[PDB]
Write a protein that binds this ligand. Structure first.
Ligand SMILES: Nc1nc2c(ncn2[C@@H]2O[C@H](COP(=O)(O)OP(=O)(O)OP(=O)(O)O)[C@@H](O)[C@H]2O)c(=O)[nH]1
Ligand SMILES: Nc1nc2c(ncn2[C@@H]2O[C@H](COP(=O)(O)OP(=O)(O)OP(=O)(O)O)[C@@H](O)[C@H]2O)c(=O)[nH]1
Ligand SMILES: [Mg+2]
Ligand SMILES: [Mg+2]
Lengths: 431, 437, 341
């Protein structure tokens, strides 16, 4: 019984966490009342990984909400599934940070870190075997990313033998109109490269393009981006929430998908892509699903895996299919003399099989790739860092709080070194 | 008299131990509940089978074994198995977290919390014995609880009981049975760590036993039960010398004098014959010279090598069942007039032969058949060096990239361990090449 | 029993040989003897074996000069604890119509391979061992004539291999056996097995207690064999490796999944345990492969409009239960046989 303590910081992180919880509640079979009305034995086979055992068979999530203002904390408490969460799991302040990393990491963040670690320890003590920690947040805000990095560092210092997962979200100009989002994006990346094991990059530019073109939406909002993020998250943790022949361990999965301790960034994808309301279209075969999941269009990141090198790949299918079909497909794809040869799939994919598809779909597939193309994203924000740091724009907001230009130079050097290492390993021999 | 204690760590280790104990109980007639109708000296005393079973007040023959595992899943099957009344609940030790196929974890993180309990249990079990010989540990090299914890326990047993032998029965992994890509990384570490805390080591090539089960036993896809039964048969054929008052290899200290002429070189080659299927119960008959000629075959050995190139340092034959000394002499003359063999002329050991007049035994309903005579040859040879040339090679394939190495350094050990381990491998290879001349 | 070589560059020192030769010199403590190529033509004086070593548990007088069968019964009589008896490769002359009983009651296993005994002869020879638990009659060119009456009702092993005259008509005579728990039939030339006494979905009354059917290296080219094997009442184990239908090629697994799909209680195949995962994989492949034909045979998800023909039922009598286990195949699951342009 491996228990994973879930965490969600910032407005975007809290919203993504709530959406993912509400999505998996319908798959596991737990009504929002806090009881299980599911009719499948496989559902309760691994429910303890994300739910606690209370009196009367009531399942309580393991999430820990954290913020610096109360607005979003109040919206989730009154949401469709706002009763399952414990009232004492909501930690918040009043003033917020103000889209400032120094104010959300060193002042208010470090001020509420005590109350947050209180609940973190209270939750960790109620677990038979703790596996790791998960956090959902963004990188274009102050409170969110600041408190996320601070809590990650604290959990690493107090629990060095625990895995860390961060479903960080990369901002984009087409979604936000804030000028200091590059600075906060650079600092969080520097902190994560030092205190993280897994980082699922979820670009906010790829999701917007998908919602605008694929879904054919006139004016997409955060509701068309959060649904996709929650769907991808549910598709990623399909093995960690249900049985499976493949090894569904978090530590072993991270070890196999983290061959490099600085290139631990993973691009996640999922086909078929659906919107809100309309989700029951058709049932795609295994070949079509594999072709769509490995397509740059079904990628949550703005980078294309084809423009790089495949280091590690993890595929997870769910629906009504046998492992033999997936194995034959994956073996014929790499066969250069077959009639189904492609040029965007490596010669080793960790395939998985499941019998519990999501809601509104009969079959689904998820892919996670440690390709080097993600470096492109690291170069997209870096350029912006050069169009501000050189002019010292809005630097009095950071230096006035306590930060030094020595912290900015170190973060820039770390980002440059990461990009250089990625580009260097991209040119390695494929032996 | 003197008894022995067998510590079974890991999944493969506990499985092999369970198979060995089942075969031992079926041979000695001990029922699952622990009732030996052939035994008459109740309470205690001295017998041939007393070296592996402790007698209680109610006449229960508790196996002298310690099954330890870092996960409760594997031990649950033993606790709820048919032999639940055979082993004592305290002898089964469980853990809450596994090593996730990691040597540093099993040797530092998870090992530091269970090593004390394991040592306390071993001390409690040894308090009843009047004279212990050694510690027959069972592990493999493709996991983190079989290499890390095994080395951690050897380090403590070499200090607590230094005047006791330490035999091992390792399992050489294979690329077809491999469960992880860092499987070699664990192997090298534990191999370098038990060199000065182990007299004789027995390695089982997974591919060799797989091919044996596919060909001899005739199985489409041999499972772990098929390979655990053959390992139990091998262990029984090897331990018959201690379980039946055999003339050859009466104690554990003789294994180092007969099959380990050099301290650093302690990896003999063990082969066994015959291997008949359950379907062909009475199809063909093998003489004492047709089964002793089948133990000089590369495909019949437990490790894929070519002994015909190198030379042998030692040799010990063990026959079990209807075997007349005249037949043994005829087989020796046949092996000495037919096959061409080389031997080290300056070795302080030579050829030895022993016989055990006891009928073979096989698990009823299994894939093996009951034979009339069996042979087991234990011969140290330089050809085993080939088995290393592969392992080390893979290490290099993983050393130029340093992939998955930070996971091992971020748990306890440092970086010089790998250089020391590969430096210990180079010295072993040089010693092998020197002995081969 | 009662009665130097220098290999390489070292001598051969023998240790413990005196203990074994002193343990074997004891004739009153012989638990097993294997007299092979000893040239045994007669039993000798009566009573000598009944007082020298009357506590033998296993005897193997294979490849000897035994002429008449009475010479073997004379030795088996003096041994009041003969648990195993093997006399293969001996041209014995058994009686023509005499039954010798009251001499092999303690016989649990009997082996007479390459002996040349026929069915009428072995029927009377086994009368002396009414409590026989195992019997081996391979490599004898035996031709069954009629079913046994009051003989071989405790035998749980019937090894009929290397016999090219064993057809289904001859197997029906040995299917009445009440305690037969195994039946070996390797290298016999059988090509088909039928059970007209039962229909589709019923259990045949033949082979009541058969639990292991070995037919390796046989003429199994039609799927009708596995389909008819479903009728067996207790067919728990099956064995079949080299047939016109079974290949050692890497593409043979596609057939294995069908075999497990043809039998319902096949928990082990080719000496390999079967799990729920294996059962589900094999059951999903069988439905994925035979869905198209089910549509053409007159199949439809409608529980009242399902009208299938007889040929499709005889070829797939285990396809209707699977239709209810995991529902019927959809239209979008039977369109995966066309490429792209
Ligand atoms: N995809 C997505 N992005 C969001 C969402 N909410 C906010 N963002 C992005 O998050 C970034 C920072 O805003 P927040 O995360 O809400 O802010 P915070 O992290 O609470 O920080 P403070 O405002 O300083 O308290 C911006 O770039 C937004 O575009 C959301 O629901 N979905
Ligand atoms: N012969 C044999 N090899 C086995 C068996 N079980 C596992 N192995 C091999 O042992 C290696 C895996 O090690 P395990 O024993 O399963 O793992 P562990 O040593 O308990 O360690 P952790 O996984 O780190 O807890 C691989 O090479 C497997 O093929 C078995 O029953 N028999
Ligand atoms: Mg906010
Ligand atoms: Mg284990």
């Amino acid at each position: 019984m491996r228990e994973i303590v879930h965490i969600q910081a910032g407005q975007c992180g809290n919203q993504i966490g709530a959406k993912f919880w509400e999505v998996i509640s319908d798959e596991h079979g737990i009504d929002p009342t806090g009881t299980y009305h599911g009719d499948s034995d496989l559902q309760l086979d691994r429910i303890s990984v994300y739910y606690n055992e209370a009196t009367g068979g009531k399942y309580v999530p393991r999430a820990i909400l954290v913020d610096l203002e109360p607005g979003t904390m109040d919206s989730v408490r009154s949401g469709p599934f706002g009763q399952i969460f414990r009232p004492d799991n909501f930690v918040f302040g009043q003033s917020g940070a103000g889209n400032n990393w120094a104010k959300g990491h060193y002042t208010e963040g470090a001020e509420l870190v005590d109350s947050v670690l209180d609940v973190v320890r209270k939750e960790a003590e109620s677990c038979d075997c703790l596996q790791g920690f998960q956090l959902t947040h963004s990188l274009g805000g102050g409170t969110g990313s600041g408190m996320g990095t601070l809590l990650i560092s604290k959990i690493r210092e107090e629990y060095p033998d625990r895995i860390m997962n961060t479903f960080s979200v990369v901002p984009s100009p087409k979604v936000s109109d804030t000028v200091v989002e590059p600075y906060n994006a650079t600092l969080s990346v520097h902190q994560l490269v030092e205190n993280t094991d897994e980082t699922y990059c979820i670009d906010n530019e790829a999701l917007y393009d998908i919602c605008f073109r694929t879904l054919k939406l006139t004016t997409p909002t955060y509701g068309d981006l959060n649904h996709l993020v929650s769907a991808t998250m549910s598709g990623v943790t399909t093995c960690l929430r249900f049985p499976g022949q493949l090894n569904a361990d978090l530590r072993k999965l991270a070890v196999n998908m983290v061959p490099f301790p600085r290139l631990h960034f993973f691009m996640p994808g999922f086909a078929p892509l659906t919107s809100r309301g309309s989700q029951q279209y058709r049932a795609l075969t295994v070949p079509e699903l594999t072709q769509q999941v490995f397509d740059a269009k079904n990628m949550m990141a703005a980078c294309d895996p084809r423009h790089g090198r495949y280091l590690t790949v993890a595929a997870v299918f769910r629906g009504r299919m046998s492992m033999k079909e997936v194995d034959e497909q994956m073996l014929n794809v790499q066969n250069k003399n077959s009639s189904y040869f492609v040029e965007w799939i490596p010669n080793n994919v960790k395939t998985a099989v499941c019998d519990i598809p999501p809601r509104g779909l009969k079959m689904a597939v998820t892919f996670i790739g440690n390709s080097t193309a993600i470096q492109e994203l690291f170069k997209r924000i870096s350029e912006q860092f050069t169009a501000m740091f050189r002019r010292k724009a809005f630097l009095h907001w950071y230096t006035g709080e306590g930060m030094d230009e020595m912290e900015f130079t170190e973060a820039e050097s770390n980002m440059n070194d990461l990009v250089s290492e990625y580009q260097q390993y991209q040119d390695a021999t494929a032996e | 008299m003197r008894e022995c204690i067998s510590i079974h760590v890991g999944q493969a280790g506990v499985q092999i131990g369970n198979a060995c104990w089942e075969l031992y109980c079926l041979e000695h007639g001990i029922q699952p509940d622990g009732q030996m109708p052939s035994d008459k000296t109740i309470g205690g005393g001295d017998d041939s089978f007393n070296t592996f079973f402790s007698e209680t007040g109610a006449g229960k023959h508790v196996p002298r074994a310690v099954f330890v595992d870092l996960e409760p899943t594997v031990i649950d099957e033993v606790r709820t198995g048919t032999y639940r009344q055979l082993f004592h609940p305290e002898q089964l030790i469980t853990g809450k977290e596994d090593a996730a196929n990691n040597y540093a974890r099993g040797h530092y993180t998870i090992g530091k919390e269970i090593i004390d309990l394991v040592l306390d249990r071993i001390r409690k079990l040894a308090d009843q014995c009047t004279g212990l010989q050694g510690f027959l540990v069972f592990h493999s090299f493709g996991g983190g609880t079989g290499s890390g914890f095994t080395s951690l326990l050897m380090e403590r047993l070499s200090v607590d009981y230094g005047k006791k032998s330490k035999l091992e029965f390792s399992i050489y992994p294979a690329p077809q049975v491999s469960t992880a890509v860092v499987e070699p990384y664990n192997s090298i570490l534990t191999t370098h760590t038990t060199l000065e805390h182990s007299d004789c080591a027995f390695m089982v090539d997974n591919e060799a036993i797989y091919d044996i089960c596919r060909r001899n036993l005739d199985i489409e896809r041999p499972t772990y039960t098929n390979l655990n039964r053959l390992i139990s048969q091998i262990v029984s054929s090897i331990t018959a010398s201690l379980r039946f008052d055999g003339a050859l290899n009466v104690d554990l200290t003789e294994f180092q004098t007969n099959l380990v002429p050099y301290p650093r070189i302690h990896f003999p080659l063990a082969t066994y014959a015959p291997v008949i299927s359950a379907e062909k119960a009475y199809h063909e008959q093998l003489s004492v010279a047709e089964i002793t000629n089948a133990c000089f075959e590369p495909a019949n050995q437990m490790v894929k090598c070519d002994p015909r190139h190198g030379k042998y340092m030692a040799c010990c034959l063990l026959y079990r069942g209807d075997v007349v000394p005249k037949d043994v002499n005829a087989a020796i003359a046949t092996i000495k007039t037919k096959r061409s063999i080389q031997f080290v002329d300056w070795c302080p050991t030579g050829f030895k032969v022993g016989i055990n007049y006891q009928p073979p035994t096989v698990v009823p309903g299994g894939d093996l058949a009951k034979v009339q005579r069996a042979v087991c040859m234990l011969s140290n040879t330089t050809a085993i060096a080939e088995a290393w040339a592969r392992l080390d090679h893979k290490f290099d394939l993983m050393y130029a990239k340093r992939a998955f190495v930070h996971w091992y350094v971020g748990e306890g050990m440092e970086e010089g361990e790998f250089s020391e381990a590969r430096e210990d491998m180079a010295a072993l290879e040089k010693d092998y090449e020197e002995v081969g001349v | 029993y009662v009665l130097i070589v220098t290999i390489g560059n070292k001598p051969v020192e023998t240790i413990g040989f005196d203990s074994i030769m002193k343990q074997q010199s004891q004739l009153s403590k012989l638990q097993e003897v294997s007299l092979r190529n000893c040239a045994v033509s007669c039993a000798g004086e009566k009573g000598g074996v009944a007082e020298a070593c009357p506590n033998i548990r296993k005897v193997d007088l294979s490849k000897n000069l035994l002429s008449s069968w009475d010479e073997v019964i004379h030795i088996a009589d003096q041994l009041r604890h003969l648990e195993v008896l093997n006399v293969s490769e001996n041209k014995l002359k058994f009686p023509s119509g005499s039954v010798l009983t009251g001499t092999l009651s303690v016989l649990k296993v009997l082996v007479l391979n390459q002996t040349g005994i026929t069915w009428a002869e072995v029927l009377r020879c086994v009368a002396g061992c009414p409590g026989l638990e195992e019997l081996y009659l391979e490599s004898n060119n035996i031709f069954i004539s009629e079913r046994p009456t009051d003989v071989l009702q405790t035998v749980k092993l019937l090894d009929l291999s290397s016999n090219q005259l064993i057809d289904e008509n001859q197997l029906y005579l040995i299917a009445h056996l009440p305690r037969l728990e195994q039946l070996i039939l390797s290298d016999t030339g059988i090509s088909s097995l039928h059970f007209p006494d039962a229909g589709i979905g019923c259990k045949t009354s033949m082979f009541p207690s058969l639990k292991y059917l070995v037919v390796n290296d046989n003429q199994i080219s039609q799927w009708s064999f596995f389909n008819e094997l479903e009728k067996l009442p207790s067919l728990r184990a099956l064995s079949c490796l080299r047939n016109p239908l079974t290949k050692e090629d890497k593409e043979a697994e596609t057939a294995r999944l069908l075999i497990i799909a043809s039998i319902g209680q096949l928990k082990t195949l080719n000496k390999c345990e079967i799990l729920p995962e294996e059962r589900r994989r094999a059951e999903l492949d069988y439905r994925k492969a035979f869905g198209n034909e089910w549509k053409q045979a007159g199949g439809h998800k409608d529980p009242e409009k399902n009208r299938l023909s007889e040929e499709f039922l005889t070829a797939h009598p285990r396809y209707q239960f699977l239709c209810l286990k995991y529902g019927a195949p959809e239209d979008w699951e039977l369109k995966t046989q066309q490429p792209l342009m």
